[PDB]
Amino acid sequence: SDPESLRWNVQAELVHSRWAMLGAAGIFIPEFLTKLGILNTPSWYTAGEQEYFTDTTTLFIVELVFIGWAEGRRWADILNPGCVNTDPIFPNNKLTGTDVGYPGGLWFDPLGWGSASPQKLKELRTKEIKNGRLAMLAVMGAWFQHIYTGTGPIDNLFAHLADPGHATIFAAFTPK
Amino acid sequence: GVIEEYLEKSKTNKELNDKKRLATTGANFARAYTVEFGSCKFPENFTGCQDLAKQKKVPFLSDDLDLECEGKDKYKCGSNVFWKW
Amino acid sequence: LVDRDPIKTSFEQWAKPGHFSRTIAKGPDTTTWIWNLHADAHDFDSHTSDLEEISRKVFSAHFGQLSIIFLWLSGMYFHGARFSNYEAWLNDPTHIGPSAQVVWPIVGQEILNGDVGGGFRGIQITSGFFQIWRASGITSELQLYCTAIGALVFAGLMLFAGWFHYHKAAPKLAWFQDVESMLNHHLAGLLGLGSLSWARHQVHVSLPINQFLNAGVDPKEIPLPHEFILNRDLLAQLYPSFAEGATPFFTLNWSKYADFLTFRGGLDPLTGGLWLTDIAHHHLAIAILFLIAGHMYRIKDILEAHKGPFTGQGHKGLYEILTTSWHAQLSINLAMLGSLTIVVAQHMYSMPPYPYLATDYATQLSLFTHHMWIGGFLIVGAAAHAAIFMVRDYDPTTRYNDLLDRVLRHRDAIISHLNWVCIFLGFHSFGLYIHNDTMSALGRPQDMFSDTAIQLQPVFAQWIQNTHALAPGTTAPGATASTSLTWGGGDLVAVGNKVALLPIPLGTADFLVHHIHAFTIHVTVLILLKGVLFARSSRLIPDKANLGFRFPCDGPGRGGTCQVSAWDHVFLGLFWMYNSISVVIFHFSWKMQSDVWGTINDQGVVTHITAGNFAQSSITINGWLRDFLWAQASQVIQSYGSSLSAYGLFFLGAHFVWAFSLMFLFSGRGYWQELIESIVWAHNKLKVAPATQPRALSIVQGRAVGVTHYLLGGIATTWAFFLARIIAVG
Amino acid sequence: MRDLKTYLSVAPVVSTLWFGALAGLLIEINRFFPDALIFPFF
Amino acid sequence: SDPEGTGGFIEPRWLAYGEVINGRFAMLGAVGLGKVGLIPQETALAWFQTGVIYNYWADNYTLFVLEMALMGFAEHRRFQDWAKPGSMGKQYFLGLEKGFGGSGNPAYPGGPFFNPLGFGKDEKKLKEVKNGRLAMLAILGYFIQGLVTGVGPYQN
Ligand code: CLA
Ligand code: CLA
Ligand SMILES: CC1=C(/C=C/C(C)=C/C=C/C(C)=C/C=C/C=C(C)/C=C/C=C(C)/C=C/C2=C(C)CCCC2(C)C)C(C)(C)CCC1
Ligand SMILES: CC1=C(/C=C/C(C)=C/C=C\C(C)=C\C=C\C=C(C)/C=C/C=C(C)/C=C/C2=C(C)CCCC2(C)C)C(C)(C)CCC1
Ligand SMILES: CCCCCCCCCCCCO[C@H]1O[C@H](CO)[C@@H](O[C@H]2O[C@H](CO)[C@@H](O)[C@H](O)[C@H]2O)[C@H](O)[C@H]1O
Ligand SMILES: CCCCCCCCCCCCO[C@H]1O[C@H](CO)[C@@H](O[C@H]2O[C@H](CO)[C@@H](O)[C@H](O)[C@H]2O)[C@H](O)[C@H]1O
Ligand SMILES: CC1=C(C/C=C(\C)CCC[C@H](C)CCC[C@@H](C)CCCC(C)C)C(=O)c2ccccc2C1=O
């Protein structure tokens, strides 16, 4: 008779999903263009030339500052104005609810027709690949496990074992 | 990591090698790549010589095919007059 | 109710405040109800007036359990495979001291885990797989890891058959309330087709793969894994391809054979299980029956038939109902299931059925006391649920005027006797011991009761035991010794470290324990019998069945009017049985070690874990803490810093939990109220309490938290006391 | 999807995913510092 | 909608007579190759003596299953797709003449049955076209283990 999901954070779940998948975009094209390595060949020296390295972790803090600000500020406003208290529109806070967030303050607003919209015209471009990208990524990320695991050599770890016949990798192809 | 010359001087190589006589497998069953065996024309126990034997014969084995069902023999029990012994 | 009825909400109700009895949970808040509802989550007064489903629910709950065992024991069988102990032990058995289970080392933990093994640190085990196990011949760790997932297969599926009932649109009356077959099937082909099927995989495969294990090897130096079909050369040893018989029958000749079988009697030497070869025959000779037997039949027919003058009219239509009581057809069952478990507990210790038991002491007495508390924990139940019948289950009266209506006719009568029975016992069944103290402490042995002093004189010997082994005068043929090795006649010879099994001859000081059991078994039952009988109406209350089998107590009047009921007869009847079993255990190990459990030594001079201290010294009931509790238990209170240690380290808690029960058992109720407010006050000053009216325990809940604790207290106390005096010497 | 002035619910014993876990991460501090009985500071 | 499998009293054997057609032409390759068989090393060994005079030269690769799952797809598609209402065959994205159907929704010798006119000759109920091919199915069933071995045909 069937569960009811519908779940209601939800519409958010789908926009969370865009983040994951559009981001998932960076990976594929670039690594793979991969230089079709490559003509040949790739050297880093340059910065990191001998400066005791470059990033390690410190690289991760900068990565995050730059981001924190962005991921953070953010959803903080994809949207959301009204912003208080007592009783429900349900979004889940819903505060923006009736008031958009502002009657009369500014142009919070973008564009014609007392609205947020860029407007009617297009699902087009980007519902099919961008969501098709919801799909794409998952299988191609599912492809990443396939691509390393089995670690040819270095590490069995803890064997009840019982492979080899032969190694695993990516270069590409498949044998067979 | 860090790099000194050239990812390799001479790239990637023998890790799949096989190339000419990219063999193993087809062949091996090189006896097989071909089967050519026995005789042409007939009488009897090919089965070589190598390979071997006539063992049980005409229908048996061969099977394999043998070939061609003769006017036989005709395996069915009964004959063989069961020659043990 | 109406969130929203019928036809028009798929939409589930989670929310708006929820349910039971019609001035349903109030709206307005309380605590008790959170305790209600785990309790009496099923009673079946409520959910529906009309049995309708419930039989349609109890099939599903059953499925859940079968799965669960399965989830269990995949677990077990895992554990058993891949933390092995087992591969190592089996080449090695009678050296090994076996674990399935290991901690990880975090904080203290790991004192615990102390070398068991074929060279690994362990927690030593006393349930034996590793002995259920011997049977598998084929071996190796990753399979049991198949038998394991084979377990998780049966589960998910034998757990989606429970979706595939109640929740799925699901079944109706006839199907149970036409019985007519049900035992037909059950006993015929499962009871049968298992034991049967078990035969087929109990000589095929197991017999041979321990026929030439009972020598050594490194397994698979013996057994290929599939090996065992069209083939078989191997049967040839262990016998013929029947060579020329036909489908048994006779025009058959043996000059030398008779098919595998060939009955054993006595124990294997160098694996003293008992022969692995009467094990096929016996299971085969079972199934047949069941195979023939489950072929009755369709019912009242037989029950409606024979009547007598005392005897009961009622016997007839002794229950249209029976098909639909349930609570009754569970109560009957528990008495049997239950009373048919602790009959295991004997045939086990005086006739092992697995390779390496007895020598393995601790890994089959754990058993004989676990199996022992079920053949008791399930019996008092087998009364409770009859009380649950005797009060409620049928809408209306129409059982009428029988056999029951008979038994009740007398009732201040069947229980009028039974009473005196007990005070006759007790006086002949305990103060008997107290004589000894009062007179051996006075000290004049001339006149005690000692096995030496008051005269029977030095034989036990002839009653049954001596006729039982001695067995073949008989229409009996068979097998060099006994059905059970212990019986008096026969043998020195059993086993390789150690003694496994020997006469046990008793005398007196087996005489009178055997009698305390009587009196203990009897006054237990008095309270349950009179409890379930006086279920519904009594000379003290007539208006007595009216809410309850539970109600707390009717009210301060009539003098007392408190305990009454029959939840409570099944509350004070547990209280006894905890002894019934708790002292039967105390009996067996003090025997089985004072005599029997052994060692062999050159020229076989037996060295009992205690040179029979029992002799003159159980008879004194202080000797029962001189020789028991203070003697053994010295291993519990020495057990610190070790490996088992978790016992000594339990033995304080749970020897605490018990001594917490009395608080729940011995106390008022508007007391912890009167207190709970002083609390509730201090609470309000800071503004921190009211919502969900905090309330004291529900008169009878308080009794529920007696008892239950008094048992998991007073019990694991010995579960510790035990595993701590068989692991290590003994 | 949750903004300002209390949110969505949860079951009877999510305390059994709060005794188990959270608290559980704490053995996780009782092996990182496999020991105590006083403690250095940061 | 969260899922449907209508069953009435005999759902089964509507299939069954179905599991049976497929199953039945699989009695089949029996009707008209025959041994995987087993657990595949030979590499040395047959059941227990099998063989002799390991099976086979044996190409085959288990990739099936990867095949069983994959064709599974077709099976369950023909069945939804026709739920139906049909766009389905797109034809030529542009233009003009598209005579060709090829006929039918098939069943049988003319997509429309066709070539109606025929025989002078060859001259002289459809669970029966089922019933007898289990009476071809369960037959090799015992013929796998079809042996008495120690002895043989008592009959004879
Ligand atoms: C390694 C394995 C070998 C084995 C053991 C199998 C086994 C199987 N294959 Mg299969 N297959 C193989 C190699 C193998 N295949 C290869 C190399 C290919 C590539 C061509 C295929 C392509 C293939 C397809 C497309 C299908 C199968 C299917 C099947 C299953 C069908 C059962 C059946 O009896 O249908 C046949 C028995 C019948 C009674 C049907 C009769 C229909 C006939 C008349 C049509 C074909 C005969 C035709 C007139 C010959 C003309 C030549 C033409 C092939 C060019 C069966 C389990 C089928 C399946 O199970 O899908 C769910 C189907 O999917 N296989
Ligand atoms: C084959 C039978 C079996 C079945 C199917 C039932 C079924 C039933 N019994 Mg029942 N019963 C049985 C055997 C069975 N009983 C036995 C053997 C006894 C004797 C002890 C009883 C004594 C009994 C009583 C007194 C009552 C029932 C009642 C009931 C009904 C209420 C069920 C309920 O709410 O769960 C109740 C379970 C709980 C609330 C769970 C609490 C369990 C606690 C005590 C834990 C046990 C200790 C354990 C060591 C703790 C776990 C470890 C921990 C330390 C970590 C139900 C129809 C009740 C009724 O009113 O009838 C309608 C009534 O209360 N039974
Ligand atoms: C139709 C058919 C058939 C059928 C098959 C089947 C399906 C079968 C079966 C078989 C079976 C069906 C078997 C069964 C068995 C069972 C058993 C063997 C039982 C068991 C159990 C157990 C083991 C338990 C135990 C215990 C106890 C003691 C109590 C509680 C606890 C525990 C659980 C531990 C045949 C063959 C003819 C073939 C043809 C077709
Ligand atoms: C401070 C604190 C605390 C406290 C703690 C303590 C102090 C404790 C204790 C405890 C004690 C002091 C005792 C207890 C005990 C318990 C028990 C004990 C449980 C259980 C059980 C079981 C599991 C069992 C089982 C069994 C069986 C199977 C049947 C019979 C036998 C036996 C019993 C073995 C905590 C941390 C908590 C919280 C926070 C605060
Ligand atoms: C079909 C082709 C796609 C549409 C784009 C082509 C241009 C046609 C106008 C739409 C462009 C959107 O931007 C524009 O929309 C209106 C069209 O009603 C413009 O023009 C109008 O704006 C108001 C509605 O928005 C009207 O009440 C005003 O009378 C008029 O000035 C706006 O000044 C501008 O915001
Ligand atoms: C414990 C109090 C004693 C009261 C019961 C005594 C009556 C029976 C005599 C002793 C009982 C023990 O039985 C035991 O006898 C002998 C010890 O002397 C041993 O005798 C065993 O050792 C030797 C080795 O070949 C031989 O003498 C025997 O052939 C053999 O049976 C056995 O291990 C056991 O069969
Ligand atoms: C001590 C005693 C009490 C008092 C016992 C009480 C009040 C026990 C109930 C205490 C509960 C279990 C505490 C529950 C509070 C926590 C579960 C809430 C916080 C949740 C956690 C995360 C800690 C009775 O109510 C009683 C009633 C009848 C006969 C005898 C007695 C009796 O002896």
mmCIF file with all atom_site columns, N, CA and C in Angstrom, chain C residues 242 244-255 257 259:
data_model
loop_
_atom_site.group_PDB
_atom_site.id
_atom_site.type_symbol
_atom_site.label_atom_id
_atom_site.label_alt_id
_atom_site.label_comp_id
_atom_site.label_asym_id
_atom_site.label_entity_id
_atom_site.label_seq_id
_atom_site.pdbx_PDB_ins_code
_atom_site.Cartn_x
_atom_site.Cartn_y
_atom_site.Cartn_z
_atom_site.occupancy
_atom_site.B_iso_or_equiv
_atom_site.pdbx_formal_charge
_atom_site.auth_seq_id
_atom_site.auth_comp_id
_atom_site.auth_asym_id
_atom_site.auth_atom_id
_atom_site.pdbx_PDB_model_num
ATOM 1  N N  . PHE C 1 242 ? 24.609 -53.274 0.211  1.00 0.00 ? 242 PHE C N  1
ATOM 2  C CA . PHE C 1 242 ? 23.308 -53.921 0.546  1.00 0.00 ? 242 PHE C CA 1
ATOM 3  C C  . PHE C 1 242 ? 23.200 -55.102 -0.387 1.00 0.00 ? 242 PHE C C  1
ATOM 4  N N  . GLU C 1 244 ? 23.376 -58.117 -1.776 1.00 0.00 ? 244 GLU C N  1
ATOM 5  C CA . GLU C 1 244 ? 22.053 -58.227 -2.469 1.00 0.00 ? 244 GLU C CA 1
ATOM 6  C C  . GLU C 1 244 ? 20.798 -58.309 -1.584 1.00 0.00 ? 244 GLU C C  1
ATOM 7  N N  . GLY C 1 245 ? 20.346 -57.251 -0.907 1.00 0.00 ? 245 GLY C N  1
ATOM 8  C CA . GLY C 1 245 ? 19.030 -57.414 -0.188 1.00 0.00 ? 245 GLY C CA 1
ATOM 9  C C  . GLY C 1 245 ? 17.613 -57.230 -0.750 1.00 0.00 ? 245 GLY C C  1
ATOM 10 N N  . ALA C 1 246 ? 17.432 -56.195 -1.579 1.00 0.00 ? 246 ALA C N  1
ATOM 11 C CA . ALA C 1 246 ? 16.088 -55.646 -1.926 1.00 0.00 ? 246 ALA C CA 1
ATOM 12 C C  . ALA C 1 246 ? 15.330 -54.933 -0.783 1.00 0.00 ? 246 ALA C C  1
ATOM 13 N N  . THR C 1 247 ? 15.356 -53.611 -0.729 1.00 0.00 ? 247 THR C N  1
ATOM 14 C CA . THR C 1 247 ? 14.250 -52.894 -0.101 1.00 0.00 ? 247 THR C CA 1
ATOM 15 C C  . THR C 1 247 ? 13.983 -53.629 1.183  1.00 0.00 ? 247 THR C C  1
ATOM 16 N N  . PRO C 1 248 ? 14.997 -53.758 2.042  1.00 0.00 ? 248 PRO C N  1
ATOM 17 C CA . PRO C 1 248 ? 14.954 -54.696 3.168  1.00 0.00 ? 248 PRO C CA 1
ATOM 18 C C  . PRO C 1 248 ? 14.343 -56.102 2.926  1.00 0.00 ? 248 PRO C C  1
ATOM 19 N N  . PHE C 1 249 ? 13.225 -56.415 3.596  1.00 0.00 ? 249 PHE C N  1
ATOM 20 C CA . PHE C 1 249 ? 12.372 -57.596 3.348  1.00 0.00 ? 249 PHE C CA 1
ATOM 21 C C  . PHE C 1 249 ? 13.171 -58.797 3.757  1.00 0.00 ? 249 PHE C C  1
ATOM 22 N N  . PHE C 1 250 ? 12.630 -60.008 3.628  1.00 0.00 ? 250 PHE C N  1
ATOM 23 C CA . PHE C 1 250 ? 13.527 -61.168 3.611  1.00 0.00 ? 250 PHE C CA 1
ATOM 24 C C  . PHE C 1 250 ? 13.248 -62.247 2.523  1.00 0.00 ? 250 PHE C C  1
ATOM 25 N N  . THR C 1 251 ? 14.228 -62.399 1.625  1.00 0.00 ? 251 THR C N  1
ATOM 26 C CA . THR C 1 251 ? 14.939 -63.624 1.380  1.00 0.00 ? 251 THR C CA 1
ATOM 27 C C  . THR C 1 251 ? 16.393 -63.269 1.337  1.00 0.00 ? 251 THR C C  1
ATOM 28 N N  . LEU C 1 252 ? 16.910 -62.853 2.490  1.00 0.00 ? 252 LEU C N  1
ATOM 29 C CA . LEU C 1 252 ? 18.207 -62.186 2.624  1.00 0.00 ? 252 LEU C CA 1
ATOM 30 C C  . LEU C 1 252 ? 19.107 -63.139 3.356  1.00 0.00 ? 252 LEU C C  1
ATOM 31 N N  . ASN C 1 253 ? 20.380 -63.158 2.999  1.00 0.00 ? 253 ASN C N  1
ATOM 32 C CA . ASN C 1 253 ? 21.311 -63.897 3.812  1.00 0.00 ? 253 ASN C CA 1
ATOM 33 C C  . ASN C 1 253 ? 22.409 -62.998 4.375  1.00 0.00 ? 253 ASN C C  1
ATOM 34 N N  . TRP C 1 254 ? 22.582 -63.055 5.697  1.00 0.00 ? 254 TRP C N  1
ATOM 35 C CA . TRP C 1 254 ? 23.859 -62.739 6.305  1.00 0.00 ? 254 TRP C CA 1
ATOM 36 C C  . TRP C 1 254 ? 24.481 -64.028 6.873  1.00 0.00 ? 254 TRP C C  1
ATOM 37 N N  . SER C 1 255 ? 25.638 -64.460 6.367  1.00 0.00 ? 255 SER C N  1
ATOM 38 C CA . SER C 1 255 ? 26.652 -65.159 7.172  1.00 0.00 ? 255 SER C CA 1
ATOM 39 C C  . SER C 1 255 ? 27.598 -64.373 8.069  1.00 0.00 ? 255 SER C C  1
ATOM 40 N N  . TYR C 1 257 ? 26.586 -60.185 8.160  1.00 0.00 ? 257 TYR C N  1
ATOM 41 C CA . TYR C 1 257 ? 26.247 -58.757 8.438  1.00 0.00 ? 257 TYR C CA 1
ATOM 42 C C  . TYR C 1 257 ? 24.872 -58.499 9.023  1.00 0.00 ? 257 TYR C C  1
ATOM 43 N N  . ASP C 1 259 ? 23.424 -54.474 8.457  1.00 0.00 ? 259 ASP C N  1
ATOM 44 C CA . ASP C 1 259 ? 23.089 -53.027 8.235  1.00 0.00 ? 259 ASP C CA 1
ATOM 45 C C  . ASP C 1 259 ? 23.264 -52.008 9.387  1.00 0.00 ? 259 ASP C C  1
#
